[PDB]
């Protein structure tokens, strides 16, 4: 069950005396004509709560007056409960008889508690407060005698705009209209330029660890997805960077170092490690940035295999990336640490040069005739994309107008030209007869098509809603523009 809080839940926002003045204030108020829950039960507590009846537990317990958490001791029963910066504020008024008629609630008590309440129970109407702007009319005695919710409707907006509870006939701008984006698209050229990783990971012939081979990889995208989801990688580890972020960063160059070692030897190809390979055949620097990939390659190497060489003796230690001997002799039957592993090390080089090696760029579909957020090949903007009748030269990617603002772009995948128009916006004005004759208004959306705004008359000036269009000309009264005027008959006409 719900009721209509016609004109209730308004309270004095502060301890300041005001007289014979109209004041605009922003605070947590119950909106006018809200749906207030009617009880005959535990309620949520949000920004604040409106409560009325014809004790409470918030654990802040108010039991009739004893209040305890901290301790403090001191017809329609109308209350407001809010808490800000640790203060639990209670507002209250008691009147004879939700009913109609405006009344503001005086402050009852400010309790310096310092607790966050999100639920409460009553031991009967419950409403909620929210951030809204209210206009308040004070009399000579400092009492609030009336109020306007500046967000309730277009006439209330007009009253707040003009700082008055009475509006003279005319047209007034009260707010702006602006169409928001509904989607977001990113478009990039569909990439075929993938890094030659096949010759690193799917090759037949590899150098041995004592004198390992390398490839220099440039002018491509590294499709890391193919490598980390490989059906046969026993290990994959990155230093200085997480695998899941590799597609968001671009290196100057990357290098693929490849060699064959035995299974239990693979833990030596890492920074900070020492051992037969780490010191004698492949030194991996402690400041290494890159990814190490390794797997069991038995099926393509081992024989029923004194082919791959490594060293037992070298007079001095190796320094990073340099390239007595023994053969591995890999055998089909061994333990997991004793068959061959194929190892690929992808080092990442970043220096003072244009970046060359990136991940693939993903694209979304193309949205037309709607407001979107967009970027085409790196250039951002927002607006409505439509087919263009313009012709770009073969090397041009986007165009600009007289004021050097993006006017159009080329679709990087199909190369059609798309115009970018602004999302409509404009002042919104209220066309009103004087308040002394009528309290209804018509609303005009300046330079807005009526089909995109959400008795509608589309005019040159804008979209006019609420006024009817008639074929009779009259002397003007409230001017709109472009030859159109409005007046009040028994409704508003244009």
């Amino acid at each position, epitope marked *: 069950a719900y009721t209509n809080s016609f004109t209730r839940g308004v309270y004095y926002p502060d301890k300041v005396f005001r007289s014979s003045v109209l004041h605009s204030t922003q605070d947590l108020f119950l909106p006018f004509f809200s749906n207030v829950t009617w009880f005959h039960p535990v309620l949520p507590f949000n920004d604040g709560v409106y409560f009325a009846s014809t004790g409470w537990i918030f654990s802040l317990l108010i039991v009739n007056v004893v209040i305890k958490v901290f301790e403090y001791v001191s017809n329609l029963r109308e209350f407001v409960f809010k808490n800000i910066d640790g203060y639990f504020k209670i507002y209250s008024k008691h009147t004879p008889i939700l009913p109609q008629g405006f009344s503001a609630l005086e402050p009852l008590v400010d309790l310096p508690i310092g607790i966050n309440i999100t639920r409460f129970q009553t031991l009967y109407y419950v409403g909620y407060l929210q951030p809204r702007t209210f206009l308040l009319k004070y009399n000579e005695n400092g009492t609030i005698t009336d109020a306007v919710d500046c967000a309730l409707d277009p006439l209330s907006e007009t009253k707040c705009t003009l700082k008055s509870f009475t509006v003279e006939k005319g047209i007034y701008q009260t707010s702006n209209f602006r169409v928001q984006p509904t989607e977001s698209i990113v478009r990039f050229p569909n990439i075929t330029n993938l890094c030659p990783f096949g010759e690193v990971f799917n090759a037949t012939r590899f150098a041995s660890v004592y004198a390992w081979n390398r490839k220099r990889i440039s002018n491509c995208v590294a499709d890391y997805s193919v490598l980390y*989801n490989s059906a046969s*990688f026993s*290990t994959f580890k990155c*230093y200085g960077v*997480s695998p899941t972020k590799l597609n968001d960063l671009c290196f100057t160059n990357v290098y693929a170092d490849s060699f064959v070692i035995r299974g*239990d030897e693979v*833990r030596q190809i890492a920074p*900070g490690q020492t051992g037969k390979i780490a010191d004698y055949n492949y030194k991996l620097p402690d400041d290494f940035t890159g990814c190490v990939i390794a797997w069991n390659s038995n099926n393509l190497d081992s024989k029923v295999n004194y082919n791959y060489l490594y060293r037992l003796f070298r007079k001095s230690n190796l320094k990073p990336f340099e390239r007595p001997l023994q053969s591995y002799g890999f055998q089909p039957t061994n*333990g*997991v640490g004793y068959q061959p592993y194929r190892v690929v090390v992808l080092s990442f080089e970043l220096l003072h040069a244009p970046a060359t090696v990136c991940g693939p760029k993903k694209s979304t579909n193309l949205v037309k005739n709607k407001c979107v957020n967009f970027n085409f090949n790196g250039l951002t903007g927002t607006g409505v994309l439509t087919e263009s009748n313009k012709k770009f030269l073969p090397f041009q990617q986007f165009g600009r107008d007289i004021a050097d603002t993006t006017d159009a772009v080329r679709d990087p995948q199909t190369l059609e030209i798309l115009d970018i128009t602004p999302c409509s916006f404009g002042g919104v004005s209220v066309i009103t007869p004087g308040t002394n004759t009528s309290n209804q208004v018509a609303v005009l959306y300046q330079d807005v098509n009526c089909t995109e705004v959400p008795n509608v008359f589309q005019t040159r000036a804008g979209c006019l809603i609420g006024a009817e269009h008639v074929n009779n000309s009259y002397e003007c009264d409230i001017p709109i523009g472009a030859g159109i005027c409005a007046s009040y008959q028994q409704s508003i006409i244009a």
Partner: antibody
Amino acid sequence: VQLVQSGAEVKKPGSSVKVSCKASGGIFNTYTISWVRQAPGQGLEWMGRIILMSGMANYAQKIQGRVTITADKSTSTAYMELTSDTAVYYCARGFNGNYYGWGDDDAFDIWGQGTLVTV
Amino acid sequence: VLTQPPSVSVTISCTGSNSNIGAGYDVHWYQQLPGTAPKLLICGNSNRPSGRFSGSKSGTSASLAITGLQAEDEADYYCQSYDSSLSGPNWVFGGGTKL
């Protein structure tokens, strides 16, 4: 990160069981999920590990052919299922403080609650 | 399987072979309280997560050192390492020591 497993259940001996495990905490540094079991009064036994990215899994030899592990990326879960004991089955993510990704020298840092299955 | 003493009244030993501990592979340590999943206390040779403990390797053996008879930490302690034998990768937990 948090790994939530299934509750206890009873199956007839010789039948099959499917145990889920959802890494609802984040999933941003989780590359692999391992399964370990502990029979009452016993120590822990590794059963298998699945790499979430590739979908590949390795298994302990003693249960090979009667165990499968499936990685469902769309739900961030790993399913441990057995065909044909009363052990507790634990779900744990692999982790190494020296590198990102997965390998042999990693460890099981964050463990789930343990799902018991009995006959 | 890694060999451990049934109980310790101190240090908890863990003895393996050159296929797992003497292999150079990291030996991790866990503390399992009854009623729940094991908690990691050592990663790698001797690193630890937030929340008394140290350790080292020697030959094919490794050990966990716990110092101070605090509270009643009567947990089941386990060592874990990678085994490089059989016919494929596998991880091995030790027998388990009651403290």
